[PDB]
Amino acid sequence: KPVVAIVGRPNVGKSTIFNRIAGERISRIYSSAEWLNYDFNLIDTGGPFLAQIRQQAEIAMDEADVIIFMVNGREGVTAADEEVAKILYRTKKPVVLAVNKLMRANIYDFYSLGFGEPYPISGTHGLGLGDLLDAVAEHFKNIPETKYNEEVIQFCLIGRPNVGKSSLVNAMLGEERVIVSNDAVDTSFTYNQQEFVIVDTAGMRKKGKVYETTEKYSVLRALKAIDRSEVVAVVLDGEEGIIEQDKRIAGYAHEAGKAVVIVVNKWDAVDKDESTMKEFEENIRDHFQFLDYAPILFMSALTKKRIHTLMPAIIKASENHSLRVQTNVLNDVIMDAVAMNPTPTHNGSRLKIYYATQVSVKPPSFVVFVNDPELMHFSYERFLENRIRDAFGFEGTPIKIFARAR
Ligand SMILES: Nc1nc2c(ncn2[C@@H]2O[C@H](COP(=O)(O)OP(=O)(O)O)[C@@H](O)[C@H]2O)c(=O)[nH]1
């Protein structure tokens, strides 16, 4: 069922590798070879230079689930490889980098491509092939049950029963900027002509057909919706304030690496004066300390006050979630941070940072090449995170930093 494609500039050894791992043609599409301990299919993208590679990568982006991006290790990273990489930045689908005909000499060069760990291989006696296919197969679990066009922004609303999820959805769908369409679990619509899907609206409308006997199935259903979304809107009740179950689902969103917006509904019904909002914010920050990146919005599904602010926040959070940073700027940001604040020491050793690069999006993840990963303490990691945020934004999304040795 999962589909794999191999992509890269001509003459890097793609055909050799393809022929090795492919079995019989499903009659285009080939089944994986009998000896493999993985079950998947391959797609051929064969069939004028920059446009030729472009079309191959576009077939791959549209029809495959996981992409292998191949380069030639003996040539190193060429302008044409960098060109292919730039085309590939346009998908959210997983891309695994394979380095053919090889290793440690140019580690940064291959990491420069921005797809993370390079898997060395040889089409002769298949050395490295086990590690490469392992890396590819591990994405197989994250393949969507329900597939939408890449353009569509997928989000969900979560929160305890009666916080106003249904009311907010109905209020947001009634604005002049929205066009509702026309799976019966999701709701499709456009906002300023951009396509969006609200994940699992059926589960939000479950009541009205069914009595609530327990929350336990509703919560489990919410976690599935989170899994399918890029942006999660955590909705809190302004009247009754924060409660312990609010933490459970929001913590899950954070650990799942999702973009997050915090929404306070029923703001109309709150006993308010000049400082009630600011104190509510601080209370959210104190209860949800792992969500410092998430913006907080105050609105009323009832009076429609500030409803106009939700979609723009979902948009911004989604954008930041998907953002890919330029490497030279990234490195200047980190060198500037290290200048501001010297690195942690341990006996006589000092952390040294050689190079940093982004490795993935949704959420943005970075590797920093160091001295010794053990000298990179959690507090210093957070310091680096905040310097990256100051320079690039990243509001609405978590980010990941990993120290690695040469
Ligand atoms: N005062 C006030 N009440 C609201 C607001 N939004 C929803 N409610 C009420 O809260 C109750 C639960 O709303 P509902 O949308 O069914 O919550 P859900 O279970 O999260 O879908 C309903 O009686 C709504 O009228 C609001 O902004 N202000």
Numbering used by the authors: 3 to 29, 41 to 60, 67 to 121, 126 to 205, 212 to 435
Sentences from the paper on this structure:
Each G domain lacks the catalytic glutamine found in many GTPases (e.g. Ras) and therefore EngA belongs to a class of GTPases termed HAS-GTPases (Hydrophobic Amino acid Substituted for catalytic glutamine GTPases). Our results indicate that potassium strongly stimulates the activity of both domains and congruently that of the whole enzyme.
The first structure, EngA1, was obtained in the presence of ammonium sulfate and GDP and was refined to a resolution of 2.25 Å. The EngA1 structure contains one sulfate ion in GD1 and one GDP in GD2. The content of nucleotide-binding sites was also well defined in the electron density maps. Despite the different nature of the molecule bound to the two G domains, the overall structures obtained are very similar to that previously published, with r.m.s differences of 0.42 Å (379 Cα atoms) and 0.31 Å (378 Cα atoms) for EngA1 and EngA2, respectively. Crystal structure of EngA with an apo G1 and a GDP bound to G2 has a global conformation similar to that previously published for B. subilis EngA with GDP in its two G domains. The EngA1 and EngA2 structures also suggest that the GD2 binds either GDP or GMPPCP more efficiently than the GD1, corroborating observation made for the T. maritima EngA structure where a GDP molecule was found in G2 while no nucleotide was added during the purification and the crystallization of the enzyme. However the GD1 and GD2 affinity for GDP and GTP are similar in solution. Thus, this apparent inconsistency may come from different kinetics of binding or from the fact that the crystallization process may preferentially select EngA molecules that contain a nucleotide bound to GD2.
